[PDB]
Each structure stands twice: as C-alpha cells, then as structure tokens.
Amino acid sequence: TPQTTDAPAFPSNRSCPYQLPDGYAQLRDTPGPLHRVTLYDGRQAWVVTKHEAARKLLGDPRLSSNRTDDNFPATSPAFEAVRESPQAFIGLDPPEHGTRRRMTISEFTVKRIKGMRPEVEEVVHGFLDEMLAAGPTADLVSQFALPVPSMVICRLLGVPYADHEFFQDASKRLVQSTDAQSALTARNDLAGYLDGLITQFQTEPGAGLVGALVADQLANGEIDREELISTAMLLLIAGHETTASMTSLSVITLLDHPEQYAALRADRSLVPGAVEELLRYLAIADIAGGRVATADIEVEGQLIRAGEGVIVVNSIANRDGTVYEDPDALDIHRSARHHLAFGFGVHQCLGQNLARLELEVILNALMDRVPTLRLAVPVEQLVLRPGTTIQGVNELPVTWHHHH
Numbered sequence: 001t002p003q004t005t006d007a008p009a010f011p012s013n014r015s016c017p018y019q020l021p022d023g024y025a026q027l028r029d030t031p032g033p034l035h036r037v038t039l040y041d042g043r044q045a046w047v048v049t050k051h052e053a054a055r056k057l058l059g060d061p062r063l064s065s066n067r068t069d070d071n072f073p074a075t076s077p078a079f080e081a082v083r084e085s086p087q088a089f090i091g092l093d094p095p096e097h098g099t100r101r102r103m104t105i106s107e108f109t110v111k112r113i114k115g116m117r118p119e120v121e122e123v124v125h126g127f128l129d130e131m132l133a134a135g136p137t138a139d140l141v142s143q144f145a146l147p148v149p150s151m152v153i154c155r156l157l158g159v160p161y162a163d164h165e166f167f168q169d170a171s172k173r174l175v176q177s178t179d180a181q182s183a184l185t186a187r188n189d190l191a192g193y194l195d196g197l198i199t200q201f202q203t204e205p206g207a208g209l210v211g212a213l214v215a216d217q218l219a220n221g222e223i224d225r226e227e228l229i230s231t232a233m234l235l236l237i238a239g240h241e242t243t244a245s246m247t248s249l250s251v252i253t254l255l256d257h258p259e260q261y262a263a264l265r266a267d268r269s270l271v272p273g274a275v276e277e278l279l280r281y282l283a284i285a286d287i288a289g290g291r292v293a294t295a296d297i298e299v300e301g302q303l304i305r306a307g308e309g310v311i312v313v314n315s316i317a318n319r320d321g322t323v324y325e326d327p328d329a330l331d332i333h334r335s336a337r338h339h340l341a342f343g344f345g346v347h348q349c350l351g352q353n354l355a356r357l358e359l360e361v362i363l364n365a366l367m368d369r370v371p372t373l374r375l376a377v378p379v380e381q382l383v384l385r386p387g388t389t390i391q392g393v394n395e396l397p398v399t400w401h402h403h404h
C-alpha cells in the first residue's frame with residue numbers, strides 16, 4: 001500500500017544547520033495556515049506554517065501554555081520532565097503569568113542590558129584570550145560559545161560561576177535528554193543545587209536576581225520555594241544554551257556565506273541588522289510554540305477545536321515568502337523585522353535583548369581578533385541536534401592563522 005499520510009511525523013531533524021528540514025519545507029509550501037501532524041506517541045496535532053497566523057495565534061488568549069494539561073503537545077518522551085514539574089511562568093497563563101514575570105523584568109530592561117555592555121565585552125575577550133593562547137585547534141562550543149553566556153547569566157542571576165562545571169553538565173543532560181528518566185535526573189540535580197542556594201541566601205543575603213527573590217518575594221510568601229527553583233532554573237538554562245547555540249550556528253552559517261561575512265567585517269554598522277537576520281534564519285527554538293486550545297478557534301476556514309494541541313513553528317513562519325522575499329536565502333542587508341524567533345505576545349522572549357547584545361559583541365570580537373577563523377572539519381561531518389530540542393551542535397572544531 002502507499003505510505004502517504006495526511007499528518008506527517010513531527011518534529012523532523014535538520015540535515016543542514018541553516019536550512020529547514022525537508023519535511024518542514026513542504027509544510028511551509030502547503031496552502032493555508034494550519035496542517036495536521038503526528039507526534040511521537042501517535043497523537044495528532046496542529047502546526048502553524050504561516051507568519052500572519054503564527055503571529056495572530058501567539059496573541060490569542062484561547063491558546064493556553066499550561067504544560068500540565070493532558071492535551072499539551074509533547075514532542076518527545078523527555079518532555080514528561082517539565083509536565084511532571086512545578087511550572088515557571090513560561091507555562092503559566094494570565095493573570096498568574098504576569099505576576100511572576102514582573103518579578104524578573106528589572107534585570108532585562110533595555111537600559112539595564114545596554115549598561116551591561118562593558119561587562120560582556122570583558123567576558124568575551126577574556127575567553128578569546130585563553131582560546132587563542134592555547135593554540136589551534138579548539139572546540140568553539142566548550143571554550144567560547146558556552147562559557148561566555150554562562151558567566152554573564154550567572155552574574156545576573158547571582159549563581160556562583162565556581163560551580164559552572166556542575167550545572168552546565170546538568171543543563172545539557174536536561175535539554176538534550178531523549179528519555180524521561182535522564183531528563184528527570186538532570187532536572188532534580190539542578191533543583192537540589194538551587195534549593196541549597198536558596199537556603200544559603202536566607203542565611204547571608206546574596207546578589208543577583210535569585211538573591212533578590214529570596215529576600216523579598218519568598219520572605220513575604222508571594223512565591224513558593226519550588227516556583228523560585230523552576231524560575232531560576234528556566235533563566236539559568238535559557239541563559240546558557242540559546243546564546244551558545246546561536247553563536248555556534250551563526251559561525252557555521254557565516255563561514256558558508258563568505259561574501260556576506262566579508263561585508264559584515266568591512267562595515268560593523270551592519271552587525272545589529274545581521275543579528276536580526278541570523279535570528280530569523282536560524283530559529284534555534286522553533287519547538288518553543290506548544291499550546292493547547294481551551295476554546296474553538298476559527299482560522300481562515302480551518303477550525304481548531306478545544307482540547308487540541310497547537311505548535312507554532314517559528315522557523316517555518318520565519319520562512320514565509322509573502323513576508324520575506326526569497327526566504328531561504330541568508331541576506332544580512334534585508335529587513336528581518338517582525339520575525340518570530342523570539343515569539344510574540346505575553347510570552348515573548350524575556351531575554352531577547354540580552355541575546356542581541358551578546359551576539360553583537362561576540363561577532364565583533366571574532367571579526368576583530370580571529371578574522372582567519374575557519375572550520376577544522378567539513379560541515380557535513382558535524383553532528384546536529386535532533387528537532388526535539390534546541391537546534392545546534394555539541395562540538396565545533398575550529399582553527400585559525402596562529403602566532404605568538
């Protein structure tokens with residue numbers, strides 16, 4: 001019998017780091033904003049494949065972010081770790097979501113992020129000194145891409161960087177876990193570490209956002225101790241892994257487009273616009289759109305019923321040709337405005353401007369100090385993460401014109 005189905009398996013893995021999987025490109029090319037897929041357990045779900053409908057549904061209050069809902073579209077067995085756990089505000093709906101998010105916004109405002117630029121530049125150049133002094137070759141992930149945002153978010157959260165080896169390992173084991181067992185164990189490792197940190201800040205008040213939440217909201221019973229752990233865990237893990245993966249993939253992508261990398265190096269005013277285009281193009285968090293409908297929603301003839309899972313795939317929506325002409329082409333000179341790599345609505349990425357600053361400083365630093373940077377292995381030799389997690393590589397062997 002023929003094997004063609006009306007709801008293809010979802011998600012799919014990338015074979016090229018800066019191109020949609022073949023299964024996503026056909027979903028992008030089907031007409032209409034919605035299309036059925038099949039999750040890992042056999043459940044069917046909706047995916048959004050157009051930019052305007054993705055933007056409209058991300059702001060529709062009839063789509064809930066409640067992870068604990070039984071109908072929430074889980075995309076892997078490892079997802080049972082966050083469902084079975086107390087929720088941070090990413091999995092909350094209004095009004096409870098707003099009261100929790102307000103406790104954290106002070107550390108991510110524009111004026112606070114801009115003020116952090118001297119500190120971030122010191123952090124980037126510090127790890128660039130060490131990598132260049134150790135001689136080629138080098139793993140760009142473990143020696144630069146991961147340590148730089150790790151130290152920045154640790155200073156922002158109040159987490160001691162002296163323990164970086166522990167929680168970096170546990171954060172990997174959680175994000176790239178393939179079964180619920182290794183995911184549960186990694187999450188418990190981070191929870192146990194953070195709970196000890198909370199007790200530590202109750203004896204002597206600490207710094208950062210975690211120290212402030214312990215001395216203020218937790219002391220007044222406005223947040224549960226376990227809510228504080230999930231919130232701190234969310235910020236810690238999002239603070240490391242997203243920026244590290246954007247850096248690794250942005251380096252890979254720019255090295256495969258040397259004409260645009262040359263233009264970027266010649267005119268640094270293009271860096272902020274190239275970051276926006278890289279965010280649209282790469283879209284490393286395109287699974288970050290899971291929703292469950294609480295009421296019936298009509299979208300251009302199609303009907304989402306209450307209790308159905310919806311997955312807004314921002315990587316597909318960022319390749320909408322009616323918004324960005326020739327969407328599959330990298331183009332640092334294009335207007336990448338209104339892209340959905342950071343989401344949209346009340347759950348729009350809290351640390352989107354920290355990531356913009358981190359990537360801007362990092363790209364300028366690599367072009368200033370290692371302009372001869374190239375990949376020590378062919379791109380096809382690299383191992384990409386599957387579509388069930390944050391896009392990126394685990395290793396990135398690089399080399400350069402060395403001398404000292």
Ligand code: HEM
Pocket residue numbers: 065089090091101234235238239240242243246283284285288289290314340341342343344346347348349350351352354355
């Ligand atoms: C670097 C690339 C990044 C990308 C592509 C990205 C992407 C996203 C997306 C798409 C969402 C929406 C999730 C949803 O609607 O369910 C989101 C939310 C969020 N992100 Fe990011 N993010 C990045 C960096 C960061 C950083 C550096 C932080 C640091 C704290 C962060 C913290 C958060 C938080 C706390 C939320 C939840 C917002 C809310 O629920 O109100 N992200 N992110």
Ligand SMILES: CCC(C)(C)C(=O)O[C@H]1C[C@@H](C)C=C2C=C[C@H](C)[C@H](CC[C@@H](O)C[C@@H](O)CC(=O)O)[C@H]21
Pocket residue numbers: 078079081082085086087088090174175176177230231233234237238241242285287288289389390
């Ligand atoms: C193992 C699955 C994994 C990768 C954590 C995940 O799919 O997340 C993704 C998808 C979606 C929620 C949005 C995301 C954007 C930024 C973050 C990095 C975020 C981590 C979500 C957070 O929920 C994970 C732990 O914090 C669990 C918890 O706090 O209960 C990430």
